[PDB]
Amino acid sequence: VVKAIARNSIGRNGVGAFVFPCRKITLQFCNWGGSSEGMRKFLTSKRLDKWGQEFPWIQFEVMRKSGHPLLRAEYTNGREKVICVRNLNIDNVENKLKLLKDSDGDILRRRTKNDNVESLNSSVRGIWSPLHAAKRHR
């Protein structure tokens, strides 16, 4: 007799159709506040339009608040990066925005040496066994 075990599938984003990780970016600035100058300049100066043209899968919100200028991204996995861009020039802000768009949303993490590939798949060759080895031990 055979019975099922209820189990769910694991989504591999890349393999079938690539859904782009960055979904939304919020440009936040202040009209007062000298720290928000470079952000304000960026918003003004035709760069944002170009960016939006380049990346039509990201939505680009533009908000005004009293505090420091902010770049909060929003990713497919549900995580949210928020970069404060206080006192940065236009070009630095743009670089920060580029960095954000590049990111897959996942948390930052220490990797050990050669911790390269991350598989869900069972090994193509088996796992080693001392009884089934080619050269028997002594």
Partner 1 sequence: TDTTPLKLSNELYAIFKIHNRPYLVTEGDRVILPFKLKQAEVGDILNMTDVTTLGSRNYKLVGHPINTSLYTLKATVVGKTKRAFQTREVTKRRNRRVRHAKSKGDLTILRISELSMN
Partner 2 sequence: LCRREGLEKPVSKLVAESGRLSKSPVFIVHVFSGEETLGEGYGSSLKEAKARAATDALMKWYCYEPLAQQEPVIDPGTVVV
Partner 3 sequence: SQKIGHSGLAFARLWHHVDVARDKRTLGRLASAIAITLIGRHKPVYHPSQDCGDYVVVTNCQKIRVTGKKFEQKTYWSHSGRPGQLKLQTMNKVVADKGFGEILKKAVSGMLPKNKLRKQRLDRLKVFDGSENPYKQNITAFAHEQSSIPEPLKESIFNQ
Token representation of residue 118: 């991350």
- Which of the residues 16 through 55 are near partner 2 (CB under 8 A)? none
103 near partner 1 (CB under 8 A)? yes
Pick from 117, 129, 25: nearest CA to 80: 25
10 near partner 2 (CB under 8 A)? no
Pick from 28, 47, 32: nearest CA to 91: 47
- Which of the residues 76 through 135 are near partner 2 (CB under 8 A)? 129, 131
Q: Rounded distance, CA 39 to CA 45, Å?
A: 10
Q: Which helix (H) or strand (E) holds 42?
A: helix 37-44
> Helix, strand or coil for residue 49?
helix
The item of partner 3, partner 1, partner 2, none sharing an interface with residue 104, based on CB under 5 to 8 Å by kind, is: partner 1
Looking at the Cβ atoms of 78 and 130, the one nearer to partner 2 is 130
Interface residues with partner 1 (CB under 8 A) are 12-16, 18, 20-21, 101-104, 106, 108-111, 115-121, 124-126
